[PDB]
Amino acid sequence: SCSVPSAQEPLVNGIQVLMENSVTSSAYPNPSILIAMNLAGAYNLKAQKLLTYQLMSSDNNDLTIGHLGLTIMALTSSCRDPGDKVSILQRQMENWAPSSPNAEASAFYGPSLAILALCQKNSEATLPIAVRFAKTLLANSSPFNVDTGAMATLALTCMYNKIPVGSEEGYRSLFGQVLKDIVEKISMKIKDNGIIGDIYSTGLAMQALSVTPEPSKKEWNCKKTTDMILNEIKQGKFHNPMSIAQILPSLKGKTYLDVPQVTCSPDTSASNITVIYTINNQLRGVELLFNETINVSVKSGSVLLVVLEEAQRKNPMFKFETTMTSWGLVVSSINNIAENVNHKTYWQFLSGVTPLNEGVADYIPFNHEHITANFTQY
Numbered sequence: 076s077c078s079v080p081s082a083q084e085p086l087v088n089g090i091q092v093l094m095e096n097s098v099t100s101s102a103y104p105n106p107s108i109l110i111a112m113n114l115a116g117a118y119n120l121k122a123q124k125l126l127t128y129q130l131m132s133s134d135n136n137d138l139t140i141g142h143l144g145l146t147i148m149a150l151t152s153s154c155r156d157p158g159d160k161v162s163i164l165q166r167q168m169e170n171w172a173p174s175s176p177n178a179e180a181s182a183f184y185g186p187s188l189a190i191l192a193l194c195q196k197n198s199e200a201t202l203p204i205a206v207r208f209a210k211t212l213l214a215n216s217s218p219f220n221v222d223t224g225a226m227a228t229l230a231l232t233c234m235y236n237k238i239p240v241g242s243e244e245g246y247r248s249l250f251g252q253v254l255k256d257i258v259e260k261i262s263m264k265i266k267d268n269g270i271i272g273d274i275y276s277t278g279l280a281m282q283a284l285s286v287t288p289e290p291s292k293k294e295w296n297c298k299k300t301t302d303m304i305l306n307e308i309k310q311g312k313f314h315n316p317m318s319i320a321q322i323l324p325s326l327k328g329k330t331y332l333d334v335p336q337v338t339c340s341p342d343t344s345a346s347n348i349t350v351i352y353t354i355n356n357q358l359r360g361v362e363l364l365f366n367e368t369i370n371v372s373v374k375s376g377s378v379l380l381v382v383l384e385e386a387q388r389k390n391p392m393f394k395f396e397t398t399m400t401s402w403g404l405v406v407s408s409i410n411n412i413a414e415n416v417n418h419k420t421y422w423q424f425l426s427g428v429t430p431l432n433e434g435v436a437d438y439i440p441f442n443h444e445h446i447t448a449n450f451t452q453y
């Protein structure tokens with residue numbers, strides 16, 4: 076009802092190639108990219124094989140609940156036995172629970188990914204965990220996250236459709252109800268322009284909407300959203316391979332639920348712009364900061380990361396560390412104080428007062444932008 080117009084296909088093909096082309100021996104092995112190219116039908120068979128091998132050999136002790144889920148699905152989409160990882164994931168999940176009943180919505184993202192994976196390998200063995208998961212989700216009150224909601228509906232839809240014959244005890248009722256719940260919250264996060272939540276959460280939301288068993292009261296204009304996406308691509312919004320990985324499936328009319336059905340082997344300085352960069356902190360382990368600066372970055376371009384690099388050059392001791400992930404460079408430490416996920420604490424970036432929608436290697440700061448780095452919690 077809202078496929079990509081065969082006229083815009085070249086556009087989709089292009090980003091697919093951009094995304095596959097990012098796979099290299101040093102590149103961070105991204106399971107979402109593998110899933111995406113496999114659901115789309117891979118172009119570059121060497122990149123396909125390389126990534127598949129990097130994941131087959133990933134160490135189970137290096138992966139988080141969500142990594143694990145993603146990696147199990149990626150291998151499966153490459154028609155490779157995940158073996159070991161599913162057992163490991165199953166037991167970690169029987170041991171999972173949120174930090175509290177007021178835990179942030181995104182706390183559920185990884186677990187959603189895991190349940191989806193486990194659901195694909197053995198639905199019945201996953202009921203216990205999924206029932207518990209649905210109840211925990213039903214009980215949470217935090218402000219809604221579309222990305223998480225999307226993942227959660229996929230996982231629950233997977234279960235919803237695999238209710239064991241004979242085992243007829245409101246499991247369907249529970250999952251259906253929580254799904255209805257989430258769809259209502261996903262809808263109503265739907266802008267008039269077609270965006271759902273935000274651009275980088277729209278791809279996942281499209282998968283969820285095309286797959287929940289029960290739509291929301293307010294109808295969703297699918298075409299309006301896919302058209303908005305195509306235009307966004309044409310404006311250079313999807314240059315991040317991970318961002319391509321999250322919309323490609325939708326653009327090809329597939330979702331993570333199609334993974335099990337994948338067919339394999341198919342037939343130093345200054346310049347022109349000056350930015351104002353503040354770094355902050357307020358705390359427990361004391362050590363409070365609050366120091367500004369003005370940086371001279373090139374043209375516009377020199378991503379917001381050049382700003383941080385030059386600021387470290389002036390050496391006001393406020394240097395930093397960066398850590399690699401599926402989305403790119405994450406600023407993990409500033410002036411000798413790291414993120415530490417145990418304390419649900421990290422560095423949040425913002426323009427003025429509003430948080431950035433892109434990372435430091437992607438964002439392009441304007442004229443005299445005041446970009447702050449508050450060390451908050453989530």
Ligand code: B12
Nearest residue numbers: 141142222275276401402403406422423424431432433434
């Ligand atoms: C949870 C979450 C966070 C938490 C992470 C907790 C944790 N360490 O587990 C925290 C609060 C730290 C965070 C921060 C930010 N995030 Co965030 N985050 C998410 C979310 C909801 C789920 C990710 C996840 O757990 N995936 C499952 C696991 C298993 O996969 P993973 O690959 O291992 O996940 C890792 C990465 O996703 C990484 N990560 C999280 N956010 C970001 C952002 C950037 C720019 C990068 C490079 C990496 C990164 O954290 C995980 C640790 O490895 C996503 C949604 C999505 N679509 O991906 C948004 C999302 C990835 N985040 C986003 C953004 C923009 C940010 C920030 C730049 C916001 C800001 N500060 O202004 C900050 C940047 C931090 C910094 N200082 O560099 C955007 C990215 C858009 C883009 N880059 O084009 C997304 C897509 C949300 C959206 N729809 O807008 N995030």
Ligand SMILES: *[C@@H]1O[C@H](CO)[C@@H](O[C@@H]2O[C@H](CO)[C@@H](O)[C@H](O)[C@H]2NC(C)=O)[C@H](O)[C@H]1NC(C)=O
Nearest residue numbers: 355356357358423425427428429449450451452
């Ligand atoms: C920067 O970070 C601080 C602390 O993380 C934020 O201040 C908190 O504001 C919240 C409001 O949601 C209060 O409940 C907390 O008590 C405050 N924290 C502290 C340390 O007292 C501050 O608002 C953030 N600045 C932004 C987003 O511009």
